[PDB]
Tab-separated table of C-alpha atoms and ligand atoms in Angstrom:
chain	number	residue	atom	x	y	z
A	1	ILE	CA	0.148	0.061	-0.037
A	2	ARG	CA	2.806	2.411	1.066
A	3	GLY	CA	-0.009	4.674	2.183
A	4	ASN	CA	-2.512	6.816	0.648
A	5	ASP	CA	-2.609	10.384	-0.390
A	6	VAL	CA	-6.151	10.594	-1.747
A	7	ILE	CA	-9.051	11.568	0.243
A	8	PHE	CA	-12.634	10.499	-0.810
A	9	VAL	CA	-15.441	12.894	0.431
A	10	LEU	CA	-19.172	12.724	0.180
A	11	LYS	CA	-21.400	15.943	0.256
A	12	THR	CA	-24.233	14.413	1.942
A	13	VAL	CA	-18.742	13.130	-3.969
A	14	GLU	CA	-15.000	13.941	-4.652
A	15	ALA	CA	-11.638	12.784	-4.553
A	16	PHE	CA	-9.251	15.566	-3.306
A	17	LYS	CA	-5.385	15.561	-2.132
A	18	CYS	CA	-4.275	17.400	1.131
A	19	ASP	CA	-3.550	20.760	-0.825
A	20	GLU	CA	-6.770	20.233	-2.747
A	21	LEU	CA	-8.977	19.805	0.330
A	22	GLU	CA	-7.304	22.599	2.355
A	23	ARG	CA	-7.913	25.023	-0.557
A	24	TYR	CA	-11.718	23.874	-0.952
A	25	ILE	CA	-12.079	24.183	2.878
A	26	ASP	CA	-10.667	27.749	2.785
A	27	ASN	CA	-12.747	28.725	0.034
A	28	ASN	CA	-16.021	27.232	1.236
A	29	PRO	CA	-16.308	27.103	5.262
A	30	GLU	CA	-19.843	25.876	5.139
A	31	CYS	CA	-19.364	23.107	2.828
A	32	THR	CA	-20.298	19.703	4.522
A	33	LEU	CA	-18.039	16.961	3.445
A	34	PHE	CA	-17.579	13.517	4.949
A	35	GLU	CA	-14.341	11.835	4.644
A	36	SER	CA	-14.571	7.985	3.567
A	37	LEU	CA	-13.080	5.243	1.728
A	38	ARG	CA	-12.999	5.235	-1.908
A	39	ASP	CA	-12.549	1.626	-2.128
A	40	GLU	CA	-13.126	-0.613	0.824
A	41	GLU	CA	-10.872	-3.672	-0.652
A	42	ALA	CA	-8.124	-1.752	-2.207
A	43	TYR	CA	-6.939	0.484	0.830
A	44	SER	CA	-8.671	-1.146	3.811
A	45	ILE	CA	-5.631	0.097	5.928
A	46	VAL	CA	-6.676	2.952	7.800
A	47	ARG	CA	-5.700	4.862	10.869
A	48	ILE	CA	-7.336	4.076	14.395
A	49	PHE	CA	-10.144	6.682	15.391
A	50	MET	CA	-12.719	7.288	18.054
A	51	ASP	CA	-15.576	9.601	18.601
A	52	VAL	CA	-16.747	10.807	22.015
A	53	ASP	CA	-19.643	12.608	23.076
A	54	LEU	CA	-20.681	13.597	26.635
A	55	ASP	CA	-23.697	16.149	26.912
A	56	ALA	CA	-22.102	18.150	29.902
A	57	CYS	CA	-19.631	20.869	30.471
A	58	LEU	CA	-16.291	20.281	32.450
A	59	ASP	CA	-13.546	22.610	33.666
A	60	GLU	CA	-9.792	22.288	32.729
A	61	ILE	CA	-8.550	20.215	35.344
A	62	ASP	CA	-11.348	17.628	35.467
A	63	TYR	CA	-11.110	17.433	31.445
A	64	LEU	CA	-7.249	17.048	31.711
A	65	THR	CA	-7.193	14.112	34.207
A	66	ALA	CA	-10.215	12.556	32.512
A	67	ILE	CA	-8.376	12.682	29.109
A	68	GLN	CA	-5.424	11.181	30.437
A	69	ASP	CA	-7.063	8.279	32.087
B	1	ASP	CA	3.897	27.740	54.476
B	2	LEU	CA	0.918	25.516	53.624
B	3	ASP	CA	-0.430	24.041	56.971
B	4	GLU	CA	-3.447	21.788	57.787
B	5	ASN	CA	-5.640	24.749	57.336
B	6	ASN	CA	-4.069	26.408	54.527
B	7	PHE	CA	-2.824	23.577	52.218
B	8	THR	CA	-4.702	24.619	49.198
B	9	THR	CA	-4.476	28.398	49.862
B	10	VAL	CA	-0.817	29.095	49.273
B	11	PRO	CA	0.469	27.948	45.959
B	12	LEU	CA	3.627	25.872	46.141
B	13	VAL	CA	6.860	27.189	44.377
B	14	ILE	CA	9.471	24.841	43.454
B	15	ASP	CA	13.033	25.082	42.407
B	16	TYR	CA	14.424	25.257	38.783
B	17	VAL	CA	17.549	22.970	39.345
B	18	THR	CA	15.752	20.099	37.391
B	19	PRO	CA	13.008	20.282	34.700
B	20	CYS	CA	9.584	19.400	35.714
B	21	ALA	CA	9.208	15.782	36.921
B	22	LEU	CA	5.693	15.771	35.128
B	23	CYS	CA	6.468	17.375	31.724
B	24	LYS	CA	10.223	17.877	31.422
B	25	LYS	CA	10.108	21.608	31.340
B	26	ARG	CA	12.950	23.687	32.702
B	27	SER	CA	10.903	26.788	33.916
B	28	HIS	CA	7.074	27.302	34.176
B	29	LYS	CA	4.973	30.494	33.977
B	30	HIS	CA	3.507	29.992	37.300
B	31	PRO	CA	4.016	27.903	40.536
B	32	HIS	CA	2.124	24.650	41.281
B	33	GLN	CA	-0.961	24.371	43.437
B	34	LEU	CA	-2.678	21.797	45.408
B	35	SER	CA	-6.532	21.023	45.634
B	36	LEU	CA	-8.801	18.531	47.245
B	37	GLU	CA	-11.381	16.325	45.389
B	38	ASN	CA	-13.098	13.325	46.866
B	39	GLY	CA	-10.377	12.684	49.186
B	40	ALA	CA	-7.600	12.891	46.671
B	41	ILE	CA	-4.947	15.695	46.464
B	42	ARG	CA	-4.737	17.100	42.814
B	43	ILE	CA	-1.323	18.725	42.015
B	44	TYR	CA	-1.214	21.142	39.003
B	45	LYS	CA	0.330	24.189	37.717
B	46	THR	CA	-1.548	27.391	37.331
B	47	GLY	CA	-1.319	29.798	34.227
B	48	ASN	CA	-0.890	27.363	31.158
B	49	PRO	CA	-3.025	24.265	32.025
B	50	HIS	CA	-1.681	22.157	29.135
B	51	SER	CA	1.764	22.705	30.170
B	52	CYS	CA	1.756	20.500	33.160
B	53	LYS	CA	-0.034	17.266	33.452
B	54	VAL	CA	-2.288	16.773	36.719
B	55	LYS	CA	-1.031	14.454	39.141
B	56	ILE	CA	-3.079	12.782	41.817
B	57	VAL	CA	-2.214	11.470	45.319
B	58	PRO	CA	-4.803	9.476	47.452
B	59	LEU	CA	-5.365	9.483	51.021
B	60	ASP	CA	-6.976	6.222	51.293
B	61	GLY	CA	-7.012	5.033	54.797
B	62	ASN	CA	-7.504	1.428	55.589
B	63	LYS	CA	-5.959	1.504	59.193
B	64	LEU	CA	-4.531	-2.004	58.941
B	65	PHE	CA	-2.657	-0.951	55.771
B	66	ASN	CA	-1.254	2.236	57.707
B	67	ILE	CA	-0.289	-0.222	60.278
B	68	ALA	CA	1.548	-2.528	57.916
B	69	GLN	CA	3.191	0.379	56.182
B	70	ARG	CA	4.419	1.941	59.603
B	71	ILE	CA	5.865	-1.549	60.484
B	72	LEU	CA	7.626	-1.871	57.132
B	73	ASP	CA	9.128	1.784	57.928
B	74	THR	CA	10.915	0.761	60.822
B	75	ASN	CA	12.418	-1.983	58.804
B	76	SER	CA	12.152	-5.016	61.102
B	77	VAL	CA	10.995	-7.653	58.458
B	78	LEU	CA	13.244	-8.686	55.651
B	79	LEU	CA	12.938	-11.206	52.868
B	80	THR	CA	16.098	-13.389	52.592
B	81	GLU	CA	17.341	-14.754	49.342
B	82	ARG	CA	16.001	-18.303	50.124
B	83	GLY	CA	12.625	-17.003	50.392
B	84	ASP	CA	12.063	-16.904	54.281
B	85	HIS	CA	11.518	-14.062	56.244
B	86	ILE	CA	13.790	-13.043	59.036
B	87	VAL	CA	12.387	-10.676	61.819
C	1	LIG	ZN1	5.904	21.169	34.377
């Protein structure tokens, strides 16, 4: 694989590079793009990611210790 | 300077001989600070919060554990290389 430098996005589609995506984001701040996989079988190697949502507000100290743990 | 009644009031000032034991920084913007939360002492620097990671020290209790710790502090029980304790 040797890595991938192409990012496929869906508007609710495009295949942009790092500079291309940066320029498009700078031009359109309100555009809603979702990063996905252009081909599941070809480049299934991806990073490790997680999404966290807690409907409350925390101070700096509590957030720091909680994120460390 | 920090007593039993003023432990969290006076921020603790440290020396700069060695870098921070928590973040390896030579010098920090502000001195450290101690706070109490659920029977645990949190140690953290003021000013830049992300500069220093928060440390935690618990004051647990369990009288029998304290007694065991104190008896170990006197250094009366030892473990020989053969695996048998000497007192
Ligand atoms: Zn530090």
